[PDB]
Design a binder for this molecule. Structure first.
Ligand SMILES: *[C@H](C(=O)N1[C@@H]2CC[C@H]1CN(c1nc(OC[C@@]34CCCN3C[C@H](F)C4)nc3c(F)c(-c4cc(O)cc5ccc(F)c(C#C)c45)ncc13)C2)[C@@](C)(CC)C(=O)O
Ligand SMILES: Nc1nc2c(ncn2[C@@H]2O[C@H](COP(=O)(O)OP(=O)(O)O)[C@@H](O)[C@H]2O)c(=O)[nH]1
Ligand SMILES: [Mg+2]
Length: 165
């Protein structure tokens, strides 16, 4: 069983650091901000051996029929914002609507950088936003690995739930 997962959200929220934490179990400080790449990881989730294909998005903001079709291949999306960056949180509506445009799509709201003291987005605002979308909210830190497996595995569970419909 394979799951095509896509990680989306504003520049600098930690999409690459979250992806590398899942794949390598290490925190990366300076992953090239412009690079969009995909990685595979074999995991066992709820007893089921799964191949996660994770697309870590990046690059210029462009919309082409080609990019729409590429995004449409994703089966589940992590909507990542950073808890110390209000604009990244405000941009979540944009990412969710782009996914719905190109595709009931499995998604998880991820509030990353949970280790920082400089919070600007409170937990309740994010919980409320996730509730309005009918999706889970997971707090993470790519630095300490808090919530990292939970965010990806919850996304896989959401895909499984969608496939049952
Ligand atoms: C920054 C960088 O890597 N990125 C910037 C933010 C994330 C990536 C790709 N970029 C991008 N940006 C937006 O919206 C940004 C913003 C803020 C400025 C004005 N914009 C409109 C809103 F206000 C939010 N959206 C993007 C996309 F929607 C997509 C994309 C494109 C298509 O065709 C379909 C699609 C379907 C589902 C999706 F989830 C997405 C996504 C994502 C889709 N593509 C990119 C995108 C800009 C960088 C590191 C540049 C390398 C930097 O600035 O230095
Ligand atoms: N403290 C802290 N820093 C993070 C975390 N995630 C990413 N970073 C840092 O934030 C910056 C941007 O992260 P990156 O993964 O490149 O963001 P991306 O543009 O969304 O791919 C880098 O300096 C990362 O080391 C986190 O959870 N906590
Ligand atoms: Mg990146």
């Amino acid at each position: 069983t394979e799951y095509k997962l896509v990680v989306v959200g504003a520049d600098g929220v930690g999409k690459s650091a979250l992806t590398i934490q899942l794949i390598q179990n290490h925190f990366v400080d300076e992953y090239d901000p412009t690079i969009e790449d995909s990685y595979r990881k074999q995991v066992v989730i709820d007893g089921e051996t799964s191949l996660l294909d994770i697309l870590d998005t990046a690059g210029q903001e462009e919309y082409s029929a080609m990019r729409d079709q590429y995004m449409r291949t994703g089966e589940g999306f992590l909507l990542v914002f950073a808890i110390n960056n209000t604009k990244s949180f405000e941009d979540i509506h944009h990412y969710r609507e782009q996914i719905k445009r190109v595709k009931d799509v499995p998604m998880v709201l991820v509030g990353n950088k949970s280790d920082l003291p400089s919070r600007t987005v409170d937990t309740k605002q994010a919980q409320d936003l996730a509730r309005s979308y009918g999706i889970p909210f997971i707090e993470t830190s790519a630095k300490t690995r808090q919530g990292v497996d939970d965010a990806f595995y919850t996304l896989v569970r959401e895909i499984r739930k969608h496939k049952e419909k």
